[PDB]
Amino acid sequence: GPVPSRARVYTDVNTHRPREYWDYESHVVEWGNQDDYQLVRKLGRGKYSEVFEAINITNNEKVVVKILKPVKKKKIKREIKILENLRGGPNIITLADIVKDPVSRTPALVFEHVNNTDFKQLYQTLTDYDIRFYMYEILKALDYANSMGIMHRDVKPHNVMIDHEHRKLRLIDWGLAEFYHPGQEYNVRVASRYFKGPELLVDYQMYDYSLDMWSLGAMLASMIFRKEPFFHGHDNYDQLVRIAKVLGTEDLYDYIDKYNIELDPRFNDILGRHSRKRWERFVHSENQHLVSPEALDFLDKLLRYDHQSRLTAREAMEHPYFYTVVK
């Protein structure tokens, strides 16, 4: 069967924790006062919750309220525990409170407010420098989470809140995030299609933090090449084919061969044979100002089939691409 895999970093952080740190099932929620908060506007509704702009009349500050749908009964304590574990970390969204919504009769998570600009309108204007700046900020969040034994598993532009005016960034929606336990098998039905790592698409369950570095790379590619999304699959199968048309099929087979993975036989008729492409073919007059040798090398080291070969978040922060960013 499949060969096992372990993260190359932060492998044993949770094993050296009291059970309570990662045992989210046993967590006892501290409930706040629902009447502290007044809902102002509905912002949106995801699969697992409805999201509101609200006000915290106890102090009068603006907050964000995520009223959890009757979800997968236990995603709740997982998200709460992860949020509490990561609170105060660099660019980690701050859980301000947890209350019981009187109408939904479900938990309502209360967050810090962030003044975001739609990523679409936002990415059409970001300069080269600003791409680097904000990527570095995202990496701080990811490395922090990983050092705390947690992977986000849903990195995508919609989950990065950016207050461009204040050049402030927050990584949000930790509802899919998990504790990393070496040797543990995970659900491959995580992340959004265009940001799913090859490991998910070939149904390899023993993945780790490095999943999010693929997603970050897919984000970066869309930004520096001005192509949304960069890997544009019709479904999860076509998604892998779109990746293979860039990274090539030989390295794909090397990957699944290394882990003794067998592709779904439905790929036989659709995968074809594809050479690895040089990144220069995606450069054109409209995106050239966003591209540099450093950008391409950085991208190249994120977008690897083999999850074990990708840059870790810390290694990524060491890359020459970020030398120009003021620290």
Residue boundaries of the structural domains of the chain: 5-22+114-327, 23-113
**Strands annotated E in 120-181:** 150-151, 160-163, 168-171, 178-179
Q: Which CATH superfamily is domain 23-113 in?
A: Phosphorylase Kinase; domain 1 (3.30.200.20)
Cα radius of gyration (the chain): 20
Method used experimentally: X-ray
Q: Which residues are annotated as a binding site for ATP?
A: 43-51, 66
Q: What is the DSSP letter of 305?
A: S
**Helix or strand run (H / E) with residue 322:** none
- Phi then psi for residue 183, to 5 deg, are 85, -5
**What would the DSSP string read from start to end of 169-237?**
EEE--GGG-EE--TT----S--S-GGG--HHHHTT-----TTHHHHHHHHHHHHHHHT-SSSS--SSHH
Cross-strand pairs, 56: 37, 61
Give how far Cα 145 sits from Cα of 89, 162, 165, 179, 209, Å.
8, 19, 26, 10, 9
**Residues 90, 96, 100, 104, CA torsion sign:** negative
Q: Which residues are annotated as a binding site?
A: 43-51, 66
Written as one letter, the residue type at 114 is V
Cis? peptide before 157, omega within 30° of 0: no
Dist. CA 6–CA 12, nearest whole Å: 10
List the structure tokens of 246: 């860039």
Is 191 strand, coil or helix? coil
Dist. CA 87–CA 131, nearest whole Å: 25
Written as one letter, the residue type at 74 is K
Given phi > 0 = left and psi -120 to 50 = alpha, else beta, which region is 149? left
- Do residues 36 and 56 make contact, with C-beta atoms less than 8 angstroms apart? yes
Active site residue 154: yes
- CATH code reported for the domain at 5-22+114-327: 1.10.510.10
List the structure tokens of 103: 């109408």
| Final resolution, Å | 1.7
From the list 130, 154, 173, 212, the catalytic residue is 154
Cross-strand pairs, 99: 108
Residue length of the chain: 327
Per-residue buried b or exposed e for 17-27, using 16+ beta carbons within 10 Å of the residue's own CB: eeeebbebeeb
